Amino acid sequence: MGIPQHQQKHALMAIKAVKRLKDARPFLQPVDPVALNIPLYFNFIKRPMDLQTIERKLNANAYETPEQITEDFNLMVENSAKFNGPTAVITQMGRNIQAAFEKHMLNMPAKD
Ligand SMILES: Cc1ccc(-c2nnc(C)c(NCc3ccc(C)o3)n2)cc1
Ligand SMILES: [K+]
């Protein structure tokens, strides 16, 4: 069920290093469109994604490929691109943490 334990451990190391980057702050938790008075968020963003959801899918063995993790990350960034604009501060921070995460994933050991 899910990626093998060594792949999962590498991915969790990656996530935990990323969470500690200041650029991660806006993605630590799910966006709360009501707390933030942005009602149009769930109309534009059909699939919200955040670092907490990713981590908890990881622990649940809900990821079958490292590419799924990367895709959820990408989606996390494309959401802010779509709702705040391509050059908003939050979007650039998303891009920065996405770069850091891919960099970490480069060293992802193989299934075998
Ligand atoms: C008026 C406005 C419009 C969009 C957004 C917004 N868009 N995307 C995301 C991922 C996001 N995350 C919440 C967050 C940002 C900073 C911290 C500490 O939490 N907020 C915030 C305010
Ligand atoms: K904006």
CATH label of the domain that carries residue 9: 1.20.920.10
For ligand 1, whether the C-beta of 18 sits within 6 Å is no
Specify if 67 maps to a domain. yes
**Cα–Cα dist 39/60, whole Å:** 31
Pocket test for ligand 1, best of 36, 47, 83 (most atoms within 8 A of CB): 36
Residue among 107, 106, 102 nearest 76 (CA): 102
The structural domain count of the chain equals 1
Specify if 52 maps to a domain. yes
Q: 3-state DSSP call for residue 16?
A: helix
Specify if 111 maps to a domain. no
CA 90 to ligand 1 center in whole angstroms? 7
Specify if 24 maps to a domain. yes
User: Residue 26: which domain range?
Assistant: 5-106
Joined tokens for residue 109: 């050991």
Instruction: Find tokens 């093998």 and name the residue.
Output: 4
Specify if 112 maps to a domain. no
- Compute φ and ψ for 40, nearest 5 degrees: -75, 5
**Do 30 and 100 touch, CB atoms closer than 8 A?**
no
**Do 42 and 33 touch, CB atoms closer than 8 A?**
yes
CA 5 to ligand 2 center in whole angstroms? 40
Specify if 43 maps to a domain. yes
